[PDB]
Amino acid sequence: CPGAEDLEITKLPNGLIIASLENFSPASRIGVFIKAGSRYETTANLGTAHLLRLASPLTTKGASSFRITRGIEAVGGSLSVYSTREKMTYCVECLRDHVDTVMEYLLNVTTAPEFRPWEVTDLQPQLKVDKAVAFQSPQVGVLENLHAAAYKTALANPLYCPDYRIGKITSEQLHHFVQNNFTSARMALVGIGVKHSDLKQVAEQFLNIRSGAGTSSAKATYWGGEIREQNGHSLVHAAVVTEGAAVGSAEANAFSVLQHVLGAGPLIKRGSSVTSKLYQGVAKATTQPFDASAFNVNYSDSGLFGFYTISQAAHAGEVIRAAMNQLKAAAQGGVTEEDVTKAKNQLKATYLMSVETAQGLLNEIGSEALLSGTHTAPSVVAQKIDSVTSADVVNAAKKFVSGKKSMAASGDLGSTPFLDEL
Amino acid sequence: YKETWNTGVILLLTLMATAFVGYVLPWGQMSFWGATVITNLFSAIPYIGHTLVEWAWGGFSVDNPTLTRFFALHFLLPFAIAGITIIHLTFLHESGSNNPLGISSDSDKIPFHPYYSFKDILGLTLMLTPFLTLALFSPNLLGDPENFTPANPLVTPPHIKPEWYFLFAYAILRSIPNKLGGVLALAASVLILFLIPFLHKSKQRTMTFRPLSQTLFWLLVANLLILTWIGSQPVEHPFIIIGQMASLSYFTILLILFPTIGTLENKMLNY
Amino acid sequence: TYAQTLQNIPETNVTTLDNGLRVASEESSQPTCTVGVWIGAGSRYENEKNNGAGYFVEHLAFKGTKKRPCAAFEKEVESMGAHFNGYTSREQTAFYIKALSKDMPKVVELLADVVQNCALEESQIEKERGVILQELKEMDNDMTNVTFDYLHATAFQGTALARTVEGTTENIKHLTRADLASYIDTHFKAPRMVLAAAGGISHKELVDAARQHFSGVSFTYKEDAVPILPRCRFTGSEIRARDDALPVAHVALAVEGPGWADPDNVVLHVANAIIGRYDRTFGGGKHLSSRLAALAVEHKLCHSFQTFNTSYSDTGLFGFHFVADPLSIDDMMFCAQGEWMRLCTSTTESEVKRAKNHLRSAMVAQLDGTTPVCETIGSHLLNYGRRISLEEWDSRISAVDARMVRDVCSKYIYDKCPALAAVGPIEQLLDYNRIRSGMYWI
Amino acid sequence: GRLMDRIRKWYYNAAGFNKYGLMRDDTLYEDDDVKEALKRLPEDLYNERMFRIKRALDLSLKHRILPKEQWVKYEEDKPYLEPYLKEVIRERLEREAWNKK
Amino acid sequence: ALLRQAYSALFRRTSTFALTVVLGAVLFERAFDQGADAIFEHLNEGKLWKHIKHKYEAS
Amino acid sequence: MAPNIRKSHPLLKMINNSLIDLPAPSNISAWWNFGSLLAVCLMTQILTGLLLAMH
Amino acid sequence: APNIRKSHPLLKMINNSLIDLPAPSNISAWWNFGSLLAVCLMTQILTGLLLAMH
Amino acid sequence: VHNDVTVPDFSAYRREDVMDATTSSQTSSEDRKGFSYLVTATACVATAY
Ligand code: HEM
Numbered sequence A: 001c002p003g004a005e006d007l008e009i010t011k012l013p014n015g016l017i018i019a020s021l022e023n024f025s026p027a028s029r030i031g032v033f034i035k036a037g038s039r040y041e042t043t044a045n046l047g048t049a050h051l052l053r054l055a056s057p058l059t060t061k062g063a064s065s066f067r068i069t070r071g072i073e074a075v076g077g078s079l080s081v082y083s084t085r086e087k088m089t090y091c092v093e094c095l096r097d098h099v100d101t102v103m104e105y106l107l108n109v110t111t112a113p114e115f116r117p118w119e120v121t122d123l124q125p126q127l128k129v130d131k132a133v134a135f136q137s138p139q140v141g142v143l144e145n146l147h148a149a150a151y152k153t154a155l156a157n158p159l160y161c162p163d164y165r166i167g168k169i170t171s172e173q174l175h176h177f178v179q180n181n182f183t184s185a186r187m188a189l190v191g192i193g194v195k196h197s198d199l200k201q202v203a204e205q206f207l208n209i210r211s212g213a214g215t216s217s218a219k220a221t222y223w224g225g226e227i228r229e230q231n232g233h234s235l236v237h238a239a240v241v242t243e244g245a246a247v248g249s250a251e252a253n254a255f256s257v258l259q260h261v262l263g264a265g266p267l268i269k270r271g272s273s274v275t276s277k278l279y280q281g282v283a284k285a286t287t288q289p290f291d292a293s294a295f296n297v298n299y300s301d302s303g304l305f306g307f308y309t310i311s312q313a314a315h316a317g318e319v320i321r322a323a324m325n326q327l328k329a330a331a332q333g334g335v336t337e338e339d340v341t342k343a344k345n346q347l348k349a350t351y352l353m354s355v356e357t358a359q360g361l362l363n364e365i366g367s368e369a370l371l372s373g374t375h376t377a378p379s380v381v382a383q384k385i386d387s388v389t390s391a392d393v394v395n396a397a398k399k400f401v402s403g404k405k406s407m408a409a410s411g412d413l414g415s416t417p418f419l420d421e422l
Numbered sequence B: 001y002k003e004t005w006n007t008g009v010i011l012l013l014t015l016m017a018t019a020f021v022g023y024v025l026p027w028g029q030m031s032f033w034g035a036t037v038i039t040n041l042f043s044a045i046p047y048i049g050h051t052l053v054e055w056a057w058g059g060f061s062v063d064n065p066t067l068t069r070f071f072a073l074h075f076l077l078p079f080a081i082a083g084i085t086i087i088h089l090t091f092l093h094e095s096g097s098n099n100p101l102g103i104s105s106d107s108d109k110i111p112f113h114p115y116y117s118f119k120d121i122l123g124l125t126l127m128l129t130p131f132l133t134l135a136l137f138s139p140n141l142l143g144d145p146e147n148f149t150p151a152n153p154l155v156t157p158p159h160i161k162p163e164w165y166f167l168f169a170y171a172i173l174r175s176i177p178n179k180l181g182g183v184l185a186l187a188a189s190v191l192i193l194f195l196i197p198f199l200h201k202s203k204q205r206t207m208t209f210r211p212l213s214q215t216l217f218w219l220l221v222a223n224l225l226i227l228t229w230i231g232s233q234p235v236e237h238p239f240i241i242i243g244q245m246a247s248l249s250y251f252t253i254l255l256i257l258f259p260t261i262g263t264l265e266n267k268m269l270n271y
Numbered sequence C: 001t002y003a004q005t006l007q008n009i010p011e012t013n014v015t016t017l018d019n020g021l022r023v024a025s026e027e028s029s030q031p032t033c034t035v036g037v038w039i040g041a042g043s044r045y046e047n048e049k050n051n052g053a054g055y056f057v058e059h060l061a062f063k064g065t066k067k068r069p070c071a072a073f074e075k076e077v078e079s080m081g082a083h084f085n086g087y088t089s090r091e092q093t094a095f096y097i098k099a100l101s102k103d104m105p106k107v108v109e110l111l112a113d114v115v116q117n118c119a120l121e122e123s124q125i126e127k128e129r130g131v132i133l134q135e136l137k138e139m140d141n142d143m144t145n146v147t148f149d150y151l152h153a154t155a156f157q158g159t160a161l162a163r164t165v166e167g168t169t170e171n172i173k174h175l176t177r178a179d180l181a182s183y184i185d186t187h188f189k190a191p192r193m194v195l196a197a198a199g200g201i202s203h204k205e206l207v208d209a210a211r212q213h214f215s216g217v218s219f220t221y222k223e224d225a226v227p228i229l230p231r232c233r234f235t236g237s238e239i240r241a242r243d244d245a246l247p248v249a250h251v252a253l254a255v256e257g258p259g260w261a262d263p264d265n266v267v268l269h270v271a272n273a274i275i276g277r278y279d280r281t282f283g284g285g286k287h288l289s290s291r292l293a294a295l296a297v298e299h300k301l302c303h304s305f306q307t308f309n310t311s312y313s314d315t316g317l318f319g320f321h322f323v324a325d326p327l328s329i330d331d332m333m334f335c336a337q338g339e340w341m342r343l344c345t346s347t348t349e350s351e352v353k354r355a356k357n358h359l360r361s362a363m364v365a366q367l368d369g370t371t372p373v374c375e376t377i378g379s380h381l382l383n384y385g386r387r388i389s390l391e392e393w394d395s396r397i398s399a400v401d402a403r404m405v406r407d408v409c410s411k412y413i414y415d416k417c418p419a420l421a422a423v424g425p426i427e428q429l430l431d432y433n434r435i436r437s438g439m440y441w442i
Numbered sequence D: 001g002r003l004m005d006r007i008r009k010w011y012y013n014a015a016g017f018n019k020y021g022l023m024r025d026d027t028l029y030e031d032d033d034v035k036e037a038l039k040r041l042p043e044d045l046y047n048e049r050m051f052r053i054k055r056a057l058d059l060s061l062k063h064r065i066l067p068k069e070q071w072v073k074y075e076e077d078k079p080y081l082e083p084y085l086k087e088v089i090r091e092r093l094e095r096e097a098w099n100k101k
Numbered sequence E: 001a002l003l004r005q006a007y008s009a010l011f012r013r014t015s016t017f018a019l020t021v022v023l024g025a026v027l028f029e030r031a032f033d034q035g036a037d038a039i040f041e042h043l044n045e046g047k048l049w050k051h052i053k054h055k056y057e058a059s
Numbered sequence F: 001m002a003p004n005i006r007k008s009h010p011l012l013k014m015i016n017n018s019l020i021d022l023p024a025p026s027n028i029s030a031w032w033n034f035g036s037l038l039a040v041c042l043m044t045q046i047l048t049g050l051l052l053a054m055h
Numbered sequence G: 001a002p003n004i005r006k007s008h009p010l011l012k013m014i015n016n017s018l019i020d021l022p023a024p025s026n027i028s029a030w031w032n033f034g035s036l037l038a039v040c041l042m043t044q045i046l047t048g049l050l051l052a053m054h
Numbered sequence H: 001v002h003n004d005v006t007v008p009d010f011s012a013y014r015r016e017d018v019m020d021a022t023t024s025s026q027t028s029s030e031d032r033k034g035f036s037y038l039v040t041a042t043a044c045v046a047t048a049y
């Protein structure tokens, strides 16, 4: 029986957007997207967003710490919170026949927390753990220091509660943070695997913390610093970037494409990346194992663009230089009209594949319905992508070779170059 | 402190058995007749009665083979008492001592020595004085004259009664006319102590701040003096009825009133 | 409703090419897709002298074919935005590609070209030789895999299943262009292969493109015959690799499992769901429904633990693995075995009722995307010789009840000599005898 | 009328813990629920309770009480723990109930 | 196979293993005693009172 | 091992953790004097008992 | 603590001296006499009491 | 590396029924356990006597 449905998307008087899509999957996945994150933190309440992330299972006004976990697990459901420096998602999954049950807890967690002091106190030593496992990937350490070297505020804020603040966050801070950010005009109630009327009747007759846009993040001031971390590691991770393009920006697609042209991740297992100019460039430079990619982040009011490079200590010099020369060589028209064609395909494919996942799809849908209120059709996003001249790409490249660069590196930097030696 | 308490009840039972068999050793009239009266009670247990008793006696009546095994037991049990006492204190040390206000004393603890080593030594001489005054100035005040007569199986003493410390139980024994019920009633008079931990209803530990429970407590104590007294009297009116009243109120107070008044007091504290 | 959504799932089409190859697929309305070939080969099919060949072959499968050399090959896949990946286990190997449905046919050609015409360039082999030797040193520092290897090494000591998938340092230092060629020619054959695809693809267009590039026909009856492997004997035993200098200890314990075909595997999985898993980052913490999870939390018993039911054609491994600090190994093990005994003796309808929902969500979650749906098809055919739809799995899972979990578990766990592997600062875990005793009486 | 109130206030004075300067809640036997409840108390309430108790024990070892002036008045007795203790018991009963289902 | 049957029926569940030891002991005793006594008396024919008793047993 | 031999020794350590450094409530009354009297009482019965047993 | 063989104030003693007590893997038969001496003692006391009663 | 580690040969000790590496050892398990448990159960009866 079931067939082709259409992606409805209402918007209540309070500005609360509701996205919805029925793909008759035997499983549902509802979520609450929110405009919040370490970006809105102040030197005064740093880490509070992180702790809030771990606090998802604490007692609420409607359900208890015990009932939340037991209740969800009872119907084989799940509940998690993912978040970037400027967005927080609270989503739950479960079989179609339990949506209504799992919904209560989701609703409770995001709109009715209690942050009981004792619960909060016992939870804090956990930031220490959570953070320790994350930092096992050097990958995460330099990115923290990158945003710190690339900015003077908002985005400069770490994504993981700083050490000195563990155990010092307070229920007041958690409450204020939620009251001032989790507001109807900053939230979207997305939801794959469900009928739109249903997901809507929920959002309204149920969500209460509301109205306004509360606290507004300070503008993203660019600093252009260089943070270096000497720690012994045989491998040196380095990332050199420049102010890139914001989200919803026309200049976005240009960079994304310059990304693939330079190379953004392997497509063939253990295989070399020929289609990767950057990879290939560095390859000809060093002889030992390494890795190099095009780094590209798009934020609300800013973004970062550059390359990231893992390499043996003694070869970080040659490897980073190479990564550079390959960017300059590209800003000087070193881009075939074909390279631009290949990229555009890799980008469209990458995009298209990155939506087969229930998670990936919900993320896609909700990301728009929050920082927009509309759903850009796949054909449109396609039309926007290829509609990028070979010039745009060489310009993007220019903007990098010209702009003020900020660099973050960590390992045995004994042979790593300083930002002013590039 | 359940385990400290239960090992304590065991210490009490062992202490009683010890004193009981020790009392037979001089082999005087009350030695023999007490042994005879009490051990015969058990031939009232169903089916295995007469068997268990004749086994214990090592024959058909309290006779020489009973004496020799009672001496062995009397020599032995005290050592078991010493052993179990170590366990008693071991469980006790798990928690430490309770105190008269019944609230946590972790905020104010002192080393056993010299505070309690001195307090206890003083407590030793304070008690030891009345002890020796009795043992030296009135040696037989507590003993039965009947025991200055060699045991005679063909001459029942007129008043077969125990030592003061068993009287209260002897009273309860005789309160229930019916060999079997009396024996159980006797047993229960002491085994009742294993139930106390389960009949606590108060929200507070002690009776320091529980006036109703305090009077009930002194009623109980007075109840026991009465039973002690009844136990030393012949089985006749008015002693018989008074005996059944005190035996009955004894169990009522521990099984019914204490837990009831405890709850009642919880309500009067708005709990 | 859940029930209906299950029924409306597009059927998996399977058709056999006369040369012995089976083509299967699940057509969805997706612009992107995954097609690949799942082969009934692996280290179990290897021998003492070619152990590691299939892995060595995995390293070359992508360095170009005869029709189109390395650079050419990579450049052709990359330039179309397709993702080429694959792997090799003990009884299964796979090479699959993710691309737009539009290229479904060009993909199929690339696949067939890979499995049938691997170049096996002599200069390449000497390079992948050094690479594999490093991957060995890297994987050597992954306690979790070092542990499961050891678990197999002993659980199946003296057999084929006792070998690692990567092979030995010697086998890798000496394998020859021949051995690799031989391995491929011996194992990658139509009857033992399955070409599965999922996404927006026409079963027809698929099989047509298939007949065209998977031509190779057989003459003798042997070529159409799939070889039955000699059975592997299970051994209750232990292997203790002690290194107190390691930060945390790893311990895996398992009893012999029934093997793909057995229906009990359904119940076994339901069982593992009751016990479940844990790791210090689970937010549910002390309120998790898993009793072992709750204990681990309350008493700080371990950094993590998992239950598993690894199936094979004729056998399997049903057990659990945990990571703990030197001084909590004993209690963890004690509690863990305790939970197993609970399974056999006192499972509750409430427990199974929940274990079932968790399992359902699990099976459904394994079909989230094209690659995972394709991986399922490749496997279902290769192991069950057909596709088992969620609608069916659900039917089977729903028939499971307390009483049934107890009987099945008792049957596989109760009073059995388990296989034990322990690595790290394992002094506190001890005595096979003691562990063997944790195998009976709740 | 004010019967229950006459009785309570009476028992309260009959009990006598107020002569030590202890609040009703200071006199609770610390079983499992009470222990959890105490862990949730705010630092200041907790330190005050601690002093009141330490003080009581010192009076008790001295065989003294506070001067009639310092006695806690029935109506000024702050039920500082009852709120937490009730929640702890509520939570416990939920779990007990749920683990049965 | 007796060992398998024995294992399944008797030695597997601890409850039945205890029942087997008890029932096994009751049967072992009865048999073992009769046997030993049997042996003892044969090794001592006509020496025990049991043997010569008849000569004076005749009221 | 440890500074003072009252804590290290396998025996004194026991005598110390139960009759010297053992933490006692500061407010226990005379009713708490009976345990020790009971213990002393027991040592005395055993003692006088043996002396009588020898005759 | 998880198992009651370690927590309990008494079993804990029985455990740390007759069950989980660490023993050398290579001790011979000459190490069997301590236990026999213990058993020997329990038996003398037992048969001794039985005789003392007569 | 751990890949080079293998379990020594226990043929010198294996019970007859699990000597052959190509035979399911489960089929003879109730036999092996049934025997050893039979010895034990007998020891108990001897001792209970
Ligand atoms: C031979 C007899 C016994 C000995 C040698 C003995 C010894 C002791 C000792 C030394 C203490 C610590 C000091 C004290 O608090 O008085 C103690 C405490 C205690 N004993 Fe006994 N005891 C005996 C019998 C009993 C009996 C019969 C009971 C009760 C049935 C009992 C119950 C307790 C309890 C519950 C404590 C805890 C005291 C507290 O509240 O702090 N004891 N005993």
Ligand code: HEM
Residues within 6 Å of the ligand: B015, B018, B019, B020, B022, B023, B024, B025, B026, B074, B075, B076, B078, B079, B081, F042, F045, F046, F047, F048, F049, F050, F051, F052, F053, F054
């Ligand atoms: C728990 C400690 C003990 C108690 C309660 C106890 C009690 C008694 C009692 C009540 C008597 C009878 C007293 C009388 O003559 O009127 C007695 C007698 C006796 N006790 Fe103990 N006794 C104890 C320990 C011992 C021990 C350990 C021995 C020596 C091994 C012992 C040996 C004797 C002897 C020889 C007699 C008989 C002589 C006599 O009557 O004085 N007693 N005991």
Ligand code: HEM
Residues within 6 Å of the ligand: G041, G044, G045, G046, G047, G048, G049, G050, G051, G052, G053
């Ligand atoms: C360390 C344990 C013991 C040792 C080494 C031991 C040794 C002996 C010896 C050498 C004899 C003389 C044996 C003979 O008749 O030729 C004897 C006799 C006796 N023992 Fe023990 N004994 C022990 C424990 C006990 C105990 C605890 C009791 C009972 C309280 C006891 C009561 C007796 C009695 C009543 C006799 C005299 C009757 C007889 O000679 O058979 N013994 N013991």
Ligand SMILES: CO/C=C(/C(=O)OC)c1ccccc1Oc1cc(Oc2ccccc2C#N)ncn1
Residues within 6 Å of the ligand: B016, B019, B020, B021, B023, B024, B030, B031, B033, B034, B035, B036, B037, B038, B160, B161, B162, B163, B166, B167, B169, B170, B186, B187, B189, B190
């Ligand atoms: C051998 O008789 C010893 C006596 C004695 O008092 O020893 C101290 C005794 C003398 C005369 C009459 C009876 C005697 O024994 C007893 C024994 C006795 O034992 C118990 C005490 C409490 C609870 C149960 C029992 C019993 N049975 N309760 C009362 N009198």
